[PDB]
Design a protein around this ligand. Sequence first.
Ligand SMILES: O=C(O)c1csc(-n2nc(-c3ccc(F)c(F)c3)cc2O)n1
Ligand SMILES: O=C(O)c1csc(-n2nc(-c3ccc(F)c(F)c3)cc2O)n1
Ligand SMILES: O=C(O)c1csc(-n2nc(-c3ccc(F)c(F)c3)cc2O)n1
Ligand SMILES: [Zn+2]
Ligand SMILES: [Zn+2]
Ligand SMILES: [Zn+2]
Ligand SMILES: [Zn+2]
Ligand SMILES: [Zn+2]
Lengths: 329, 329, 329, 328
Amino acid sequence: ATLKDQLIYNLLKQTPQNKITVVGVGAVGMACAISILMKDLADELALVDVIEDKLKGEMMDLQHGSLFLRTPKIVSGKDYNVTANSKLVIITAGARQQEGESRLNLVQRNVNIFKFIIPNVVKYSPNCKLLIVSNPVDILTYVAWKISGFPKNRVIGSGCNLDSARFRYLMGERLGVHPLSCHGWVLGEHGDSSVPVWSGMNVAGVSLKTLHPDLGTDKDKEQWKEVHKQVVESAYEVIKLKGYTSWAIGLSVADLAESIMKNLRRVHPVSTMIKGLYGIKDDVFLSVPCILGQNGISDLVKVTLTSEEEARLKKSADTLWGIQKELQF
Amino acid sequence: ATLKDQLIYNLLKQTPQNKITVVGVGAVGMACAISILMKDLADELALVDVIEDKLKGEMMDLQHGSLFLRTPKIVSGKDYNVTANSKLVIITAGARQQEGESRLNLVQRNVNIFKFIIPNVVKYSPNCKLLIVSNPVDILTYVAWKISGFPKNRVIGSGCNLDSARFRYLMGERLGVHPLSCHGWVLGEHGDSSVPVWSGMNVAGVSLKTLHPDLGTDKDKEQWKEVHKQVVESAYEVIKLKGYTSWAIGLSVADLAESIMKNLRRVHPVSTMIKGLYGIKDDVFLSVPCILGQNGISDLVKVTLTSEEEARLKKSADTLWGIQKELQF
Amino acid sequence: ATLKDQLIYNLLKQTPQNKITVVGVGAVGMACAISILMKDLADELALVDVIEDKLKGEMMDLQHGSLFLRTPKIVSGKDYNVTANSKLVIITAGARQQEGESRLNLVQRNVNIFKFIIPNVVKYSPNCKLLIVSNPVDILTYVAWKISGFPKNRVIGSGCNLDSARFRYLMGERLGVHPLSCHGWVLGEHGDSSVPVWSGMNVAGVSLKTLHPDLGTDKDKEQWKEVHKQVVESAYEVIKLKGYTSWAIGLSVADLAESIMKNLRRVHPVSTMIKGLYGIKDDVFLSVPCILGQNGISDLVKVTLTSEEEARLKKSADTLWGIQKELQF
Amino acid sequence: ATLKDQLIYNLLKTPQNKITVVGVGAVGMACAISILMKDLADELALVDVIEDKLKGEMMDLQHGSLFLRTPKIVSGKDYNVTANSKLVIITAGARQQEGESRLNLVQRNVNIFKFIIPNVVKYSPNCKLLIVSNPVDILTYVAWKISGFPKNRVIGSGCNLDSARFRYLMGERLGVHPLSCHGWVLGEHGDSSVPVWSGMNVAGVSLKTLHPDLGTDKDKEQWKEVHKQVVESAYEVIKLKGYTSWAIGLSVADLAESIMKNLRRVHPVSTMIKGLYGIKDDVFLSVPCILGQNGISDLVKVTLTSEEEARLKKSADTLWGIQKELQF
Ligand SMILES: O=C(O)c1csc(-n2nc(-c3ccc(F)c(F)c3)cc2O)n1
Ligand SMILES: O=C(O)c1csc(-n2nc(-c3ccc(F)c(F)c3)cc2O)n1
Ligand SMILES: O=C(O)c1csc(-n2nc(-c3ccc(F)c(F)c3)cc2O)n1
Ligand SMILES: [Zn+2]
Ligand SMILES: [Zn+2]
Ligand SMILES: [Zn+2]
Ligand SMILES: [Zn+2]
Ligand SMILES: [Zn+2]
């Protein structure tokens, strides 16, 4: 008898029920991981990346904190077999923006990495929801959908969940109210062509645009457009300051994971196919409000846009589609 | 009138009530910050460091995630006025040991950095608890205590809380039991010379040493002593693989912050001024199990140690004192 | 020496920092208590009531679950000295209406009861926020205000926070969307005479009244008016089925406590002094959206109401003032 | 089209972490609220025979949905509402009346469980059963016999609460949080439970080694009275408020957390103990068990003194003396 066999009588000689994989152990990947771990969303966490040392080191560092977590198994490996049986696979790997660089400048590189990553994910977790975080997220969500063969409910991009969170933060600062009570939606591209939906902004269901008709216009004496300009510029400013962004996106992704894993059916602005709305007929992916739960995106909310908002959203779709349409698979 | 005044009728025109400061926004400081944020331990978090762009970028990145948090105020700056009225001030800043640098010279460089940091902390939060996380932690805890002029109860080193968490992770992995139910205490000097207290190692109050009398000796067929060696060497391996450790330390610190901020009077093995115990006769800080609460360390547990355990604590104390006695304050 | 002194060396020989008191240990009082305990809002919980057996039993039962909580001190007694230094005191005690007793006489009995409770609360926690949960809440919040001598930011009635949560539950059931994503506000007097603000009802900032102009009217083929009718009748139905309500009130009250204790500045529809809105000239308390934080109600939202909505609030205000002016303090 | 169709464009048409609570008395509802506030389930079902009370409790919980993260709460007298539960927690049954023998009380619960348990098994054949009804060690056996489940899926709440109470009282005496005051109460829940003095420790320091009289009648400090108070505390609460609820609910939610999240923490729960401590009969008593996704996967074999071991054997004999008389 070993010490274990003297101490413990074994009765039972099972897959995880709530496994999540994070692909990519860069700063974004690891912020997603710690955020998911601290939210108790998974019974198993797997990490995958191509840099073996860094991957192992990250895994071990999380494991050493196990005592303080409620996720009893953390694994990693360059081989996708460690990701088998995931309910949710979060893809953060690939090139990221350098100072001053457009997320759209990342397309060729990250499409080529997705050509390797997505078939491997799909092979080991054929029923997962895919949550794409890598940039440009809207384009890569389309790509992941096309490569995976998944129905589109199961391919979700982090999209404008973060842009909307930034927007509500800044709104909150101007009004003196917690972001949880400042409502406003940013839709379209997670990037420079995003669309603030001024007509929907409210606190306690009081329309800000009804109170302030010039809201969001160039004529606005309070220059509320500058809030959206700051939303657009946020990642660039943070990158210039600390080299990359990580915490906000990690929190946003864990917010999405929470709705998925706990089947909440909360609404979030995430990247999905919008064909059929606003007279768009192209297979373009961008953010609109979607109901998120255990089957991914189960429904879209049809937002009532002003003609100016709709035009902006159409411009966003045209910019994204002009890229997506030329991709070769 | 402004949109704000049209929307909102002000009744009242702020002293922080549950504030935590983190000094140093390297990987350790930010892991402490995110862990504290995700455990809802503070109503205000202040970040301070000397590199202003990086500091602002970290702050902004955390603020952009505010929607997903319950800590409504996040501030930063090089000026310690941002830290005023902290209940708890966590010090992670300092110099890293260079190739060829003696331990004595490294500590002296950290003394010189502490002579700027500590009096600034003390000026703005004179009644805080100081929690030192910078390496080498036991010596820098002494440094902070001497410079601050604080009573012993309010100067705490992170010490062996992380070593014991690592130990319990490794134990759990061996026994197939969650670390929460695998008990064991690593005491003394953090890291290389720490002491595993084999007599206290247990599951459900069943003493493993009693069940397996070779436990923790060279001759043990199951080489349980390897578990402690792995705790010591775990860090080395993580450093060699990813460059540094961060996540486990962050979670360890947030565990300590939880007991302090919530006045839990849980017991943790943290570094405290131990002159008076164990035949220790110098002003050194070593980990023993301490009751932690709103006044810092209020009580400590007198662990019964074997002759060999006691000798190893004394050797550490002599070694620490041997460096401390050479420092220029 | 004793066992404790052999085990523990004492360093220091305590004011609670985040203490909450619940007055009244009926079902509502105890549901507030468990809800607060399970949200880790307090470092000390005090219970007070006049029925000494039941009070001690409730206290002990909660104490027996301390292992599973993070509120290290739970106390109780008939004497208000156990309430000292509370940040928040939650009042759930009050009269039951008698057959044939006028609403005026009933409120007068609560005045006389509050003339005992409130000055004893004020003696031991002069700087607390008072949260009145007792029915009829709007008038009892006025009574507490008048007896306490507190400024009006520190006297808060639970008001329509529950009514709005019910409304959102029912909305979410009809739409297949989590109530967190179904926005809508019920204002004015809690319960029978509450006002649903149809203009504010929305998902992702999309106004349902705009999409469906008959919303809230008797002309509506979908009878959305029945949602509010169910909000009003809900307590009646739950009372007929189980004898009383408790759980929802507890959870609602814990939501309010969270904003106050953590200084969140979230907006909640709670009872506050609304003299000067809506052509109301009297010292009456009714629910409007209020910003809640560490100083209680700091601000209120001026909701644009329809002529009918406004007239309903004014009518509640007139009825309340008709009673209040005949009370003897 | 309908408002709902004008607002929402539908793309898509089984709960994955579902819990059922059987019985909506004080204990059942305390379990329900504790489970809801710990976010352990994506669906909660409630079942009892008293339909008004059941519906009222369901609605009162539902009205709190905004504040919870359990998006579906259902109830009914028909066990079809409990389909596909991972964990079914049984709190229903008869309470012992004036003049009633233990045997007859148990039989009355056998007759109730003959309805409840097969209904549970029909709709959630792969669930774990957690028996909370009193006397728990015997009714766990009853549930096991009626269900036909393997031993690992039939768990009694057992001494998890006794142990929590003991650590509360130990903590009060020492001025340390219960989380840092370790000690295990085993065997039969309640009156005949056994405090294992040898495992009582703070930070791995054995109190018994420091204080050899610990747990003996000789003890100047009367530490035996801490265990007496564990037994008597319940009687006291019952005398004061009429019943106990909150602590049972928190204890049961602690067990459910380990099961639902596959934590493999160790808890002292009621499990079939035949083959230990000289016990040869099919009886359930509390020992420390590893709890996870498949129920009880492993038992910790605590080293007991002869006296402690005799007390469990006596309990086993008494339990078996009752069980052999029951009519299934
Ligand atoms: O994760 C850890 O456990 C960790 C990370 S760094 C770390 N260190 N660092 C020293 C250290 C640092 C500078 C010195 F001059 C020195 F002599 C030692 C000791 C540790 O135990 N330990
Ligand atoms: O859940 C609820 O919404 C609820 C439970 S009781 C409840 N009440 N209770 C009164 C009430 C209670 C005693 C009185 F003397 C009285 F004049 C009114 C009004 C409510 O709206 N409302
Ligand atoms: O909170 C508790 O700890 C508690 C509440 S009831 C409770 N009981 N109930 C019995 C019990 C019930 C019926 C019987 F026929 C019998 F012989 C014993 C034993 C407990 O230990 N214990
Ligand atoms: Zn919200
Ligand atoms: Zn523990
Ligand atoms: Zn180290
Ligand atoms: Zn009511
Ligand atoms: Zn009992």
